[PDB]
Amino acid sequence: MFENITTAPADPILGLADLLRADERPGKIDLGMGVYNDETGKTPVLTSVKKAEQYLLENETTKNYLGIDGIPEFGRCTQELLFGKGSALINDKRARTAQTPGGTGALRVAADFLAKNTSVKRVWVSNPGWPTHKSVFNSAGLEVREYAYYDAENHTLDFDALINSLNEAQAGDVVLFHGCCHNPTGIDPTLEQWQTLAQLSVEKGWLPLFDFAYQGFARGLEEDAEGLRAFAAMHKELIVASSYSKNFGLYNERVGACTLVAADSETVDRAFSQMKAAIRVNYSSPPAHGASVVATILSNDALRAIWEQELTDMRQRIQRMRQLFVNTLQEKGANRDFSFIIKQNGMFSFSGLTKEQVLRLREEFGVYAVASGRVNVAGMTPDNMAPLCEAIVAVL
């Protein structure tokens, strides 16, 4: 039965891991996958997380199955983090949250839910964008369409082209937006642009689907959610797929959530029962450990304070590497101006390097980036900055 199965094409992002371990030479620099590194080039477990794990080890009395939607406290805390402490969506009980295995798992659950319970046939994603989006929605039987977003010549958000691109989107179509720290451009809409988009969305009857994997990496927890909250004030329905992989450094514990919002509590509950049905035939119930860590931290004043400071330190170290990167590039004979990199937020930098330049950096310099020219700034340290910039200057 398996004689004729064909080898699967490598993943443009996940596949980098395979090439890295395969490469033996020393001095390799991993600027591929979006993982935070500290000044020493390691991805440590946060102190707040270690303390929460300590608490769980001493107070946990059973590993008995969680409900299909997961830990309730986790859901409450996630909703507060997304919509704000005293949000009306929470007061009117218009939102339902299912704990899922990572933000990717939330997208999959959203995809299966939409495919068999609604008339949705098309999902609009940005270009440039995150490849996994297309792969996940296509796997559920939904077609993916792309909308313009980036002005490569001016290194800015091409709002005009974005709006014109979306005019081709019909009512009932799903439009996916990155909450903040757009992957991979790092360029987000201003509050006024978000407001215009929220207004345009209601008017044309689109179903907003927010992918929120970097809350806290742009400006702050509350500020980074302003766009989403702008939409939530106008819309009766929406979907939010969020992840705690980066802001909690819980990558491998797979901690995320899929939040559903409807016009009222009876409608959301009815729709949510079908979301649970989708989860039931996938992994049944979610993994407790990671989500339990998040709930413990967010619900304990002391731990939350420590975590929030650790998040701030991560955001600040990336900002510093971002400025050291630009300076070191020009300092070593940078062919052109890379000041546009300072205005990008998040872990990445959409450098503008071509596919061949990225390939060359990999083969003769041992520097790994994504073929799109996306580099992980969070992967830069004071130690690898010099050799890193020297390789880039050599391929320009």
Add this chain to the structure above:
Amino acid sequence: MFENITTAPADPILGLADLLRADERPGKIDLGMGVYNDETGKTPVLTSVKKAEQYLLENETTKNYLGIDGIPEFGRCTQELLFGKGSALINDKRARTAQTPGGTGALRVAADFLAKNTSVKRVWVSNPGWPTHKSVFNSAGLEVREYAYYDAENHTLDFDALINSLNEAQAGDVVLFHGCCHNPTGIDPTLEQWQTLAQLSVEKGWLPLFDFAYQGFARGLEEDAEGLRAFAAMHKELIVASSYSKNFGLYNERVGACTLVAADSETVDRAFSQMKAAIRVNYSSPPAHGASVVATILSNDALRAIWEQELTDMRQRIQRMRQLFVNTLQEKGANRDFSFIIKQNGMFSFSGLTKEQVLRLREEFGVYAVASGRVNVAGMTPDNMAPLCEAIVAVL
């Protein structure tokens, strides 16, 4: 968009949890979901697990993403547990294992893999059986067919009817077998019957898919895998979905595996790349905690010894509750003979109660069982045995 979504039908097994919390009266007895309870009626964390979690808390240095297939040690140890220490399947590198979120997650991964990478169109499951099987395979677009299995009049495995039922199965069809502790009959084929089945399977060209969620609950770790090993000796290809939810008491951490076997290493690797592609568009990579606990225990001689003894104690307590159940039933005026319950292995008892009797036990006695008449013996304690048997005798 969500105005007209219909409420999802309740799950025959998972739904019991919702009715239990909704029921306020005291004295409720949960004999529904397959979860182990100790003499006190609680589902404790195993001591070996607590020790492994202790080790992880002190030695873990990062939560960085695991590869798509999970922790390699976990896979190695899982293969050894399934096929035996020095198995030829392991020597010839004919098997590939992906760590998955629970045994249900492994089934889903197997389902998606088969649906888009092979000609498989039909999956054969037993009747009586486990409802989630049909739901998972149907969700992937595969049709489910049922084969006879139980002799309700003699409380035995109707081998004749099983064979005749499967003659309608064509080559290229998938046939699902429960490794041991058949859910819900608790009646497994003898070694000789397994051998006959392995022989019949090869001859008719079926693709075996084993669901192994109770290894160690029938007779022992090695003995419980004899059937599977009988098949693995004859077949060139097969699939095994296993779970550590019960034998490790790690229900909510979602620890399972999907093992693929092919004629040779180049074929399995090629086919496995497509299995990873299936996982990639679902949850990306698996949750580390639970699987890391399992790997730690199985690879440490000291911890493994403690765990194995804890497994033995669980199996033995269930056997004792099984005999106390029968005695207490006749002792209180049991209408008929329930000695057939002693010969069933695993956590359950296929009692023979009708749907109405089960409904009545629930509504006026507060005793919860599955509509199929399946009762969780592992949920019985010396404390609830009396009231439990009195309710059952009243509905007979």
